[PDB]
Design a protein around this ligand. Sequence first.
Ligand SMILES: C[C@]12C[C@H](O)[C@H]3[C@@H](CCC4=CC(=O)CC[C@@]43C)[C@@H]1CC[C@@H]2C(=O)CO
Lengths: 35, 338
Amino acid sequence: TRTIVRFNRPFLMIIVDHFTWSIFFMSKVTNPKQA
Amino acid sequence: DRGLASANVDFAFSLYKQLVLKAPDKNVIFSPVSISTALAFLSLGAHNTTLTEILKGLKFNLTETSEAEIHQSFQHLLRTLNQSSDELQLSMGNAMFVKEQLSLLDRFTEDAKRLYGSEAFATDFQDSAAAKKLINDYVKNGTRGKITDLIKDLDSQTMMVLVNYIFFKAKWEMPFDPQDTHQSRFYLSKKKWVMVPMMSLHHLTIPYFRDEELSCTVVQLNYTGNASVFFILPDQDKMEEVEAMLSRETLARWGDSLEFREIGELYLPKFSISRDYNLNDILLQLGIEEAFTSKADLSGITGARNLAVSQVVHKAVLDVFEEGTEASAATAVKITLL
Ligand SMILES: C[C@]12C[C@H](O)[C@H]3[C@@H](CCC4=CC(=O)CC[C@@]43C)[C@@H]1CC[C@@H]2C(=O)CO
C-alpha cells in the first residue's frame, strides 16, 4: 500500500534556494489558524 | 558561496531554537537570510569588540575569513537574489533612514550603496509618526504589501534605522488542484483539532525520507525555479525531538538521504501565518552584546563612538495555497545616539 503523507499535525517548513543554499524562510506551523 | 551558506544556515538554526524557547507552542515564521543580511549591514559600521561579536554571532569563523570577504559575499548574494527571473519572484533590498544632521563617513555610505545596495534617506525622526510611515511604506513597497507594520514603536530620538526586506512568490512545480481541497482536521494536540482547508495531490513522485533516528518524515516539494521546500512531519509528540536535533548536520543528512517515492496521497493545509519579533534577547543570547550598550562601537558609521543599537525587529508572513507560496519578511535595526 502506498505511503500517505498527511500534514494534519504540527510540522516544519524550510524554504531553500538550490543556487545559493540560502534558507529564505523557516517555519513551524503549530496551528494554521492560530490567533 | 559555501562559506556563507554554512554560517547562514548555522545562524538560521541557532535563531530558530531561541525563537522557540521564548514561546514554545506558537507558530514560527522568520527569514534567516533577512536577519543575517541586516546584521552584516550593521557590521559594516561596527568596529573592535562590537564588530567581532556581530560577525561571530552570525556564525562566521573569524580566524578563517575577513570582514572584507564577508561583505563581498553578501554583495554577491544580493546580486544573485535580485537577478531577473521569469519563473520565481524574489527580491531583497536594504535601506538606511538617517537624521539629516547626522554626519556619516563617506566611506560608510559609499560602501553601503556598493555592497548592500542601500541608499541613505533623510528622515525626520522627531516627526515620529511620519518617519514610521515612511519606513513602513518602504517595506510595504518591497514586500508587495505583505509586511505592513514592521515598525510599531519608534523613538523620536532615533538617529538611524537600517532595513532589509525579502519578498518571495513562487509557483509549485506540481500545483494542487483546488477541486481536491477539502476542509479537514488539523490536530493541535492528540485530542484537540481545528478544521482547515486541506489540499491534496495523488500519485506524486517526490524526494522522500523516513527518518527513523528522529521519528519524522521529510519530503521536498519544488517550486518552478531554483527554490524548493523541505516539509518535516514529526510523529505525534516528536516535534520537540526534531527541534532539539535541528542543525546544519541534520539538514545535510536529510538532503543526502532523500529518495524518490511515488506517494499515494499528500495532504497539506492551505494557510497563512505571521509573526513579529523583538530580537534583542536572542541576539544577546548569541553573544551580540556591545552593540546594545553604552560601550557600543559603531564608529565606522560616523567616525566617532556616538551611536548604539536600541532594537532589532523582524516580521515575517507565510502564505501556502494551491498555486504556490508567497512569503516575505523584513528586519530593522534601530540606532540612537550614544
Ligand atoms: C539540502 C541542500 C544541500 C545541502 O545539504 C545544504 C542545504 C542548504 C544549507 C546547507 C548549507 C551548507 O553549507 C551545508 C549543506 C546544506 C545543509 C541545501 C538546500 C538545498 C540543497 C539540496 O536539496 C541539494 O539537492
